[PDB]
């Protein structure tokens, strides 16, 4: 069995330093292959960032300048990236990997500047002119941090007809918003809230969807 | 360097029938020692890249043979005889025969479907979020299909490009629709300088664009 394993901080500011650990088990770093860091960034692409090989010696990508080093600790058995004077564009999930097609779970490391915060959540509703037995409600989650949320609706019974669009970035603060699809028998006629939840603030609102 | 180009981008396929990708290199990728090192990979929704094939033709350890590599030299072709449901994801194609590693942009598995419009919903800011001097005007552009789809927003008739942001979903999991939100972002003093707000969506089903709209003033 080999098995790898990242750890470390999932958020680093702007101007400091990306430390991860690779805690690599069934098979011995000192005996072995290359010993990979790869990343991948919101746009699914991957990069090759670099490895450390068996007998100490490494490559790095030359995209990443001279502001990466992968040490090792033969001793645990580990090998650790570290990425200097990091970015928004460091933002990434990291791998850890050997060579022979192994790889790790892959932690989410962002960077920003921003504290954490919990969303406001507004109501969406319509305003004059809904067509047929359905309709489409909804409840705009904005400017939070650190991801994620969790929304739902009717304390989650409300299933059937349920989006929640992907969050985005919006000066230095998420937003997304959950959309919910009903008959109007159903609305305004009994009740319709939606609860969203921020666990990095213990946030719990709900907020009732009124009409007009 | 050496770059991995993949055909297609998004591969609609259908559970049981038979699918086949692309890869295309910019470089030979036969090494010195002979060996040409292309892999494929595949990730599933959720979890890491998982190896697929690791020199041209040669299947992993740990996958079914319905899986095939093909090819040599720059041009090289992933075969899959039967999709199955655990085989939706991405798909990369991999070099490790030049420095630095390179992999390819990633092409897309998604399940085929009859084409869809969509249900287009306009929301005006809540007065909760005027209070706080600001206004969103959100549009749903809801359950369609294929994912490719354009929105257009006009304030007074009059085209909206700044302060628009907006979100595809992934496929969905039980009728293979997408859905894609608009977000005109405003503050209250500029939102109320206006009085009509209209989402514009346009879709390969129509070429009619599926128009929705309100006014401030009712």
């Known amino acids: 069995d080999v098995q790898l394993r990242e750890s470390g901080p999932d958020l680093v500011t702007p101007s400091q330093s990306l430390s991860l650990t690779c805690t690599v088990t069934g098979y011995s770093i000192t005996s072995g292959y290359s010993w990979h860091w790869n990343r991948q960034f919101p746009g699914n692409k991957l990069e090759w960032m670099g490895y450390i090989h068996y007998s100490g010696s490494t490559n790095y990508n030359p995209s990443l300048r001279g502001r990466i080093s992968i040490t090792r600790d033969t001793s645990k058995n580990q090998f650790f990236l570290q990425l200097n004077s990091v970015t928004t564009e460091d933002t990434a999930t990291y791998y850890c990997?050997?060579?022979?097609?192994?790889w790790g779970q892959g932690t989410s490391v962002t960077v920003s500047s921003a504290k954490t915060t919990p969303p406001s959540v507004y109501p969406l509703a319509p305003g004059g002119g809904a067509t047929n037995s359905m309709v489409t409600l909804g409840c705009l989650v904005k400017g939070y941090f650190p991801e994620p949320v969790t929304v739902t609706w009717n304390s989650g019974s409300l299933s059937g007809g349920v989006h929640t669009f992907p969050a985005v970035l919006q000066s230095d603060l998420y937003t997304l918003s959950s959309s919910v699809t009903v008959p109007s028998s159903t609305w305004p006629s009994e009740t319709v809230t939606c609860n969203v939840a921020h666990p990095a603030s213990s946030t719990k609102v709900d907020k009732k969807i009124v009409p007009r | 360097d050496v770059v991995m180009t993949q055909t297609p981008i998004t591969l609609s396929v259908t559970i049981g029938q038979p699918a086949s990708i692309s890869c295309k290199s910019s470089?030979?990728?036969?090494?010195?020692?002979?060996?040409?090192?292309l892999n494929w990979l595949l990730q599933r929704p959720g979890q890491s890249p998982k190896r697929l094939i690791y020199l041209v033709s040669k299947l992993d350890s740990r996958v079914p043979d319905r899986f095939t590599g093909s090819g040599a030299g720059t041009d090289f072709t992933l075969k899959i005889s039967r999709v199955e449901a655990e085989d939706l994801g991405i798909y990369y194609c991999?070099?490790?025969?030049?420095?630095?590693?390179?992999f390819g942009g990633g092409t897309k598995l998604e399940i085929k479907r009859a084409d869809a419009a969509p249900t287009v919903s306009i929301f005006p800011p809540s007065s909760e979020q005027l209070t706080s001097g600001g206004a969103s005007v959100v549009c749903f552009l809801n359950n369609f299909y294929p994912k490719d789809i354009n929105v257009k927003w006009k304030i007074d008739g009059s085209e909206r490009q700044n302060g628009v942001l907006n979100s595809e979903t992934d496929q969905d999991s039980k009728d293979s629709t997408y859905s894609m939100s608009s977000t005109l972002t405003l503050t209250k003093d500029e939102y109320e300088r206006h009085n009509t707000y209209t989402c514009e969506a346009t879709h390969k089903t129509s070429t009619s664009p599926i128009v929705k709209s309100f006014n401030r003033n009712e």
């Open positions: 990997a050997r060579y022979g097609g192994y």
């Open positions: 470089q030979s990728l036969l090494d010195s020692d002979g060996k040409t090192y």
């Open positions: 991999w070099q490790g025969t030049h420095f630095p590693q390179t």
